[PDB]
Symmetry: D2
Subunit: 260 residues, 4 copies
Amino acid sequence: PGFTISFVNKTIIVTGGNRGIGLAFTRAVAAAGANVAVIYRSAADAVEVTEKVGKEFGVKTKAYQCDVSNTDIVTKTIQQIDADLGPISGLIANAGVSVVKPATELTHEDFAFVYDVNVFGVFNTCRAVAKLWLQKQQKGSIVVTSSMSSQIINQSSLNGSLTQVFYNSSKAACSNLVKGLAAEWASAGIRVNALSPGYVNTDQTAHMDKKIRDHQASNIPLNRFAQPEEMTGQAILLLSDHATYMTGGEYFIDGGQLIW
Amino acid sequence: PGFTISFVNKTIIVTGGNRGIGLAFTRAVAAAGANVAVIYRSAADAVEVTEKVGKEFGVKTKAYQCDVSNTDIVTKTIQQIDADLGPISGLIANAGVSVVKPATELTHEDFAFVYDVNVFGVFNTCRAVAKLWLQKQQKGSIVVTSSMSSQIINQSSLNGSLTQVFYNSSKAACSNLVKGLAAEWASAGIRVNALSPGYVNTDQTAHMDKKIRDHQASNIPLNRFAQPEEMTGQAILLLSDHATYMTGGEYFIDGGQLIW
Amino acid sequence: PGFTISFVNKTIIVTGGNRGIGLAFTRAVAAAGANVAVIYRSAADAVEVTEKVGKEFGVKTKAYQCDVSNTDIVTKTIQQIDADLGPISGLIANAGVSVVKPATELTHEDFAFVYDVNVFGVFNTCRAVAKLWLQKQQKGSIVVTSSMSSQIINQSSLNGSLTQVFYNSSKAACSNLVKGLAAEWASAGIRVNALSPGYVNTDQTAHMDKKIRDHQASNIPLNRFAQPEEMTGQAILLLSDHATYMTGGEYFIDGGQLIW
Amino acid sequence: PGFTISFVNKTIIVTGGNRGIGLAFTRAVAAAGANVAVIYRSAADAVEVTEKVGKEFGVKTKAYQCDVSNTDIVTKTIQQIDADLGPISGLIANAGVSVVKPATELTHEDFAFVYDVNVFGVFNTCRAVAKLWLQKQQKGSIVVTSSMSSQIINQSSLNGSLTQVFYNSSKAACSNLVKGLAAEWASAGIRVNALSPGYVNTDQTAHMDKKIRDHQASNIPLNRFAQPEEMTGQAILLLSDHATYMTGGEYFIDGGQLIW
Ligand SMILES: NC(=O)c1ccc[n+]([C@@H]2O[C@H](COP(=O)([O-])OP(=O)(O)OC[C@H]3O[C@@H](n4cnc5c(N)ncnc54)[C@H](OP(=O)(O)O)[C@@H]3O)[C@@H](O)[C@H]2O)c1
Ligand SMILES: NC(=O)c1ccc[n+]([C@@H]2O[C@H](COP(=O)([O-])OP(=O)(O)OC[C@H]3O[C@@H](n4cnc5c(N)ncnc54)[C@H](OP(=O)(O)O)[C@@H]3O)[C@@H](O)[C@H]2O)c1
Ligand SMILES: NC(=O)c1ccc[n+]([C@@H]2O[C@H](COP(=O)([O-])OP(=O)(O)OC[C@H]3O[C@@H](n4cnc5c(N)ncnc54)[C@H](OP(=O)(O)O)[C@@H]3O)[C@@H](O)[C@H]2O)c1
Ligand SMILES: NC(=O)c1ccc[n+]([C@@H]2O[C@H](COP(=O)([O-])OP(=O)(O)OC[C@H]3O[C@@H](n4cnc5c(N)ncnc54)[C@H](OP(=O)(O)O)[C@@H]3O)[C@@H](O)[C@H]2O)c1
Ligand code: NI
Ligand code: NI
């Protein structure tokens, strides 16, 4: 016996999944038996990484160069993906960026950068996929990758902020957006939810400032940064049919940071 | 391939696991392979029901009459469970009650009735198990059934409250308690999280004021109360080793009610 | 010119209004012109302190020994206050207690002690006043002293809990109870709101572990504990007719602690 | 006696201060004795309205045409205001817009519009003022008009969404942005807080179908929309020295809407 979730013959779209957390979602869903599309921006080795993933788990994988902030480019990639692997069963909007500068120095360009990917993009992908499912009367489940930063401001030092007000605020927008979409699409048997990670280990971490990184680790009850691997379980559940009564919600994987 | 969580050769305790949502948890974990200890208060058929579950899923089950509001009975019951089916791998503190009366009419007795089970009962159950795990240097995961009522006040009619202020406030207390316990037990490898259901269909529903029931359903995005089975997936994940970075959190299964 | 709130010829009840934050409230409403009924449990100088306030601010005051955890004593006291200083215009349900012990060591007796004052006591006080208002067909405003502890767990050291799980959970209950009461009494012109302080300097502060005190102030954006007087402006606003559209809310005065 | 807040000899800037809620703020702070700098986009009668306010309350006022989404113009306008009425004592970043359209039909243009004002516009204004205060070592208080929409999704009909996902999501961003800014400027003696109204009766709100507004009011505990004046008390408190321990917070004036 055992609790089993299977995505065999099912395709899940996953943005920014050629690396970082996206790659964790990539493998996880695949390992669960899913065909997977890795949307990326300019990763030189994205097509490779994808291929490697698909051959390791015995599933159908294909990468796609695509700036989620671009309406038409996203509306096509989605139409295409649905021809290479349709019909679509689930989506995981994870592509995200950030700017770190004192608030007084943030420029319009910075705002645009962050919000076009971290907020407009998420919206863009969801609408695209939703219209499709709506058009063909297909049900679906969407998982938006937010952050605990939707609730708190991160620290870079004791009582000292990690300056990225556009990032944190874009994540708040993100988590709220999930509710707005779930609200309109619920009647169409379409579910939308947010997964919000805490401090996670990624390649960039080993190259960040150590005084900072340590401090960030000093106030986590679990006493450590997460591994991207620790974010996928909640996603599978959210995508699975076990979650028919779950929509418009935000699910934190913060290691207890939000307790303090 | 697929996503699997197995509780084979593991024991899970479920309070109020003989009926309602608790039984759903019981059957769900029993189907995942765990042996189950069902704690109940006074249901005449609790023993029969529990025995059957064990026969249906081919697992070891046992029922224990144990008022969760009683310190010593709970301590003794946890010890007996550890002897009968130990070691205990997880706990679902699900037992809960309510009192529906206009706020002005609520008594101190009503307060104790609700809080002794919904808050102290949760604390007591969690503490007994945690103490055992601490003594035996064992890791564990605890899931507490709270409610979306921790965040909002329920309605019985348009703009009209379902009058049960001790219920909603006790659930808010419960969800906070989860954070408090999670903070102290984190270093001991013990995780504590809250699962908060929205409106769920149980045997009591069919006997409630239709008008109130219809009204409550008329404002849920998914347009219906949940079936108890819809709460189990999240519970299983929280109990599983995949949820290693999840503690002190509250996970809603409200069908979008919190959207509004 | 200026913004002025006058409570001349109005009476406010303050539970725990003889010392600590409660006394700050008493003094503030008195300075605003209100007559004040001070409820206390056993302080030997409660009468003297209350008399001094009246003389200092030229208002009528009276102290009432009244255990808020007891239904009938509260009912009788509210009736006497109405007879002595009626009509009652507002209430600050401020009396509260705590128990600091590791969670595993907390008892049912500790639970009763904290919850009978912090939750039942608040409910009971609110209920007695509201019943009088409803009977006499009078309008009113109630402010409950909760705590930022309703949202977070406090620290006694870096990544180390200030162990008082019944306190934090009781405050979460309190803040939710405010919503429940506000929901039922809204149509009768009775508003109920929670005021939630962060770390505050009181007489007990000067006698607490200095290491703990320093740690707690080290992670507050404003770099310091608040003075009791800094809690009064919000209370006066909530009690006034400027707050006609404010009910069911929780108003934090945390110095930015909740930002992190 | 009485509680009195005086802004005599102080200058407050109010964006969108020529009509709706912004005009209520303007009048409220003028009545408190503050000089007012009113920022507007293109209103044809803003000058007349602003002047009338000054003459009515015997304070100095001036209107400034200034698109808050424009970096340079805002910077220039702030410089001019400082020269004209400086030092600036407070800022109410109130300007805001919305787009009501089914989520599937929303465009990038719509995104840029809403977010340039509701988020960047707020950031831009706060930053222009903050930089000035820092350069001159001046303390100050900032209030940002967000919305309860930061937490929930509005309805247009029973279980039917008021489709404007970009609005609600931008407000969530806004309230988070307040925390972000408050975190960085706390050590500088600058406080930042969000004031989040429920349904308010302004000309703009009145533009949507009365059927929709009747539905909305039917589910507000206070059973009506607020008048803009009902938002002013909290703003005055936040801008005042009584709010010295209040920063990074969100203060709802929702009529109890968030109770449900
Ligand atoms: N790292 C953390 O501790 C943490 C915590 C909470 C939340 N998150 C969120 O989780 C996500 C991934 O985090 P991460 O640290 O792995 O990020 P990362 O290492 O910076 O990876 C982000 C990925 O997004 C893609 N991307 C960037 N801009 C894009 C655009 N315009 N269109 C399409 N794709 C774009 C990039 O693909 P290309 O490689 O091809 O350029 C990049 O791989 C982000 O949303 C992040 O905000 C991260
Ligand atoms: N029903 C809903 O729509 C709903 C929604 C959200 C959350 N919840 C929460 O989910 C949990 C279960 O709900 P439910 O609807 O299944 O409840 P139920 O149908 O009322 O069953 C609750 C069970 O708890 C047990 N119990 C009560 N007091 C106890 C005590 N002192 N000691 C030991 N056991 C005790 C009872 O055992 P006996 O069978 O022996 O009487 C009862 O079976 C509760 O915490 C509830 O508040 C319910
Ligand atoms: N201190 C803080 O940093 C802090 C922070 C956040 C929130 N708060 C909250 O603010 C409130 C006041 O705090 P505080 O520090 O001023 O408290 P305190 O110094 O401990 O005084 C509390 C008062 O409550 C009264 N009281 C206790 N039990 C009572 C009962 N059964 N019946 C009637 N009165 C009773 C006592 O009256 P007697 O004088 O006769 O003993 C006592 O004066 C509490 O709700 C507390 O939880 C405090
Ligand atoms: N009304 C409600 O029920 C309600 C509820 C919650 C929150 N709010 C929020 O409260 C605020 C005001 O609401 P309202 O109903 O009074 O709105 P309104 O009647 O639409 O007024 C908004 C004002 O903002 C100004 N504005 C717009 N874009 C601007 C820009 N780019 N630069 C400078 N000024 C700009 C406009 O000036 P011009 O006059 O020259 O056009 C306009 O007067 C908004 O932030 C809104 O989101 C309103
Ligand atoms: Ni926090
Ligand atoms: Ni709500």
